[PDB]
């Protein structure tokens, strides 16, 4: 109760494993990413799939 | 960011001395002298 103001859409929630808010999740899902080599990838690139 | 050979992983958290990769840092401390790796 912050004086009647609703901050529930920008505050984090404990249900998600990553403590990101609703608008943060919308921003992260909206920007598509290339899924580059920052993830470990040589095991995926070795197996021809 | 790969794997680290020659540094023990500790379950503590300090300031980042030597930045390694995604959330992993390494430092030189007394706990004899040794190189550790932490978050
Ligand atoms: C704040 O908004 C959410 C939906 O955006 C709503 O579920 C919640 O009840 C609101 N908070 C209050 C105190 O009404």
Curated annotation (Swiss-Prot), chain A:
Residue positions with a glycan: 6
Annotated spans, Fusion peptide 1: 21-42
Disordered: annotated segments: 33-49
Site location (Cleavage): 20-21
Function according to Swiss-Prot or TrEMBL: Precursor of the fusion protein processed in the biosynthesis of the S protein and the formation of virus particle. Mediates fusion of the virion and cellular membranes by functioning as a class I viral fusion protein. Contains two viral fusion peptides that are unmasked after cleavage. The S2/S2' cleavage occurs during virus entry at the cell membrane by host TMPRSS2 or during endocytosis by host CSTL.
Entry protein name: Spike protein S2
Gene name tied to this protein: S
């Amino acid at each position: 109760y912050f004086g009647g103001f609703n901050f529930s859409q920008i505050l984090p929630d404990p249900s998600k494993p990553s403590k990101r808010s609703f608008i943060e999740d919308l921003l992260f899902n909206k920007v598509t990413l290339a899924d580059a080599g920052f993830i470990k990838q040589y095991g995926d690139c070795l197996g021809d799939i | 960011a790969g794997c680290l050979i020659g540094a023990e992983y500790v379950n503590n958290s300090y300031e980042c001395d030597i930045p390694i990769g995604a959330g992993i840092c390494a430092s030189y401390q007394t706990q004899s002298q040794s190189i550790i790796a932490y978050t």
